[PDB]
């Protein structure tokens, strides 16, 4: 996260870290046994880390649970990042408490102008490189589809939305990938892509979760 703030330990209780010997992407806990992330975060050998603040210090509220199964969206296209969404099943259920909690799925899609909360452990610099140990947060608005398509001509599908600031300075970044965009108490996006981080006229592009609720519900009901 570029241009954000330190969240506070466990104030984002649905945030997870995906670890494959190192933190590599974020995710969102949607019930005691399932995590939502980005399909471009796919790898074999994922351990899910819940209740994290400092990802380099065991502080005592963590739960570390291996993945039993990964499910990339059937229509995921890695060239265009269309349908950039994956489900991860945990080997055992998490214990939900004040520090580890699930986030609701949306019933309707979020509105342009809504201020959302984006979080993660990704790079904090534009170019240059500095990775935080503690979770970072950013408030950012949903942009109009018109402005999104103007920023990224020929590249935005109906399964993507833009959030952030056309002036630059504040954005998600590499290592935030897979993490949540929460708007009005629901998971409305997944950190997906963008041109650089926090560059003028190049806002963040997010997977539009409201288009995937049927797929999520049917997949959880069968696995
Ligand atoms: Ca920790």
Curated annotation (Swiss-Prot):
Residues that, per the record, bind substrate: 171-172, 174-175, 177
BP GO annotations: digestion; proteolysis
Classification via SUPFAM superfamilies: Trypsin-like serine proteases (SSF50494)
Post-translational modifications: Subsequent cleavage after Lys-125 leads to alpha-trypsin. Further cleavage after Lys-170 yields pseudotrypsin. A cleavage may also occur after Arg-99. Not sulfated on tyrosine residue(s).
Identification of the protein by name: Serine protease 1
Record entry for activity regulation: Is inhibited by scorpion cyclotide trypsin inhibitor TopI1.
Recorded name of the encoding gene: PRSS1
Organism: Bos taurus (Bovine)
Subunit structure comment from the entry: Interacts with SERPINA1.
UniProt key word Secreted: yes
Active site: 40, 84, 177
SMART domains per record: Tryp_SPc
């Amino acid at each position: 996260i570029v241009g954000g703030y330190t969240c506070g330990a466990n104030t984002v209780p649905y945030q997870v870290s995906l670890n494959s010997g190192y933190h590599f992407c974020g995710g969102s806990l949607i019930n005691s046994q399932w995590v939502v992330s980005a399909a471009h975060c796919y790898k074999s050998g994922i351990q899910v880390r819940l209740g994290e603040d400092n990802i380099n210090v065991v502080e005592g509220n963590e739960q570390f649970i291996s993945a039993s199964k990964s499910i990339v969206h059937p229509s995921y296209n890695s060239n265009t990042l269309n349908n950039d969404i994956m489900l991860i099943k945990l080997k055992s259920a998490a214990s939900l408490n004040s520090r580890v909690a699930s986030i609701s799925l949306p019933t309707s899609c979020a509105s342009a102008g809504t201020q959302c909360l984006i979080s993660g452990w990704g790079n904090t610099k534009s170019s240059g490189t500095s990775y935080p140990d503690v979770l970072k947060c950013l408030k950012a608005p949903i942009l109009s589809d018109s402005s999104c398509k103007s920023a990224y001509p020929g590249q935005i599908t109906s399964n993507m939305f833009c959030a952030g600031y056309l002036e630059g300075g504040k954005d998600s970044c590499q290592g935030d990938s897979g993490g949540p965009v929460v708007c009005s108490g629901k998971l409305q996006g997944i950190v997906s892509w963008g041109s650089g981080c926090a560059q003028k006229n190049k806002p963040g592009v997010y997977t539009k979760v409201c288009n995937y609720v049927s797929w999520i519900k049917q997949t959880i009901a069968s696995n």
